[PDB]
Amino acid sequence: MNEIQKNIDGWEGKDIGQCCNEFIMEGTLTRVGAKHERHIFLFDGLMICCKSNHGQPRLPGASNAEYRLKEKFFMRKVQINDKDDTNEYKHAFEIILKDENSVIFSAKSAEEKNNWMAALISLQYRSTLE
């Protein structure tokens, strides 16, 4: 949370570093829904999306959370759906995470795209097996 506290906001949650906080997957996905980006961070406890659009003051006031940790407790059952055509589109797909919510991630790394969906498919996979 120390190396993450400088990329979150209100560090939501009641002590996670003790419950886990083991960032399963570390990566930043863009939300193709209004030119918006956020540093995604699926924790072994839940999913946390660190919003990222602009900066904020109070930098010299001990801080550096340019982003904003967004509560996303669905990793326990996600559903990524790489619904894109790059060749025809940019580089984003639909993400169907628990709590019935669809997103529009935007990756630029063939690996990230795979690690983006693989990571999600990793947990979502534990929602029936393992």
CB-side neighbour CA atoms (13 Å) of 36? 13
Provide the number of structural domains found in the chain: 1
Question: Using what technique was this structure determined?
Answer: NMR
Distance CA 1, CA 21 (A): 8
The parent domain of residue 25 ranges over 1-130
Q: Does residue 48 contact residue 65 with C-beta atoms inside 8 Å?
A: no
Element (H, E) at 7: none
Distance CA 67, CA 53 (A): 7
Distance CA 43, CA 20 (A): 8
Distance CA 117, CA 110 (A): 11
DSSP E strands, the chain? 23-26, 29-31, 36-43, 47-52, 68-72, 80-81, 93-97, 101-105
The length of the chain in residues reads 130
Can you say how many angstroms the Cα of residue 67 is from the centroid of all Cα atoms in its chain? 12
Residue 53 sits in a domain whose CATH number is: 2.30.29.30
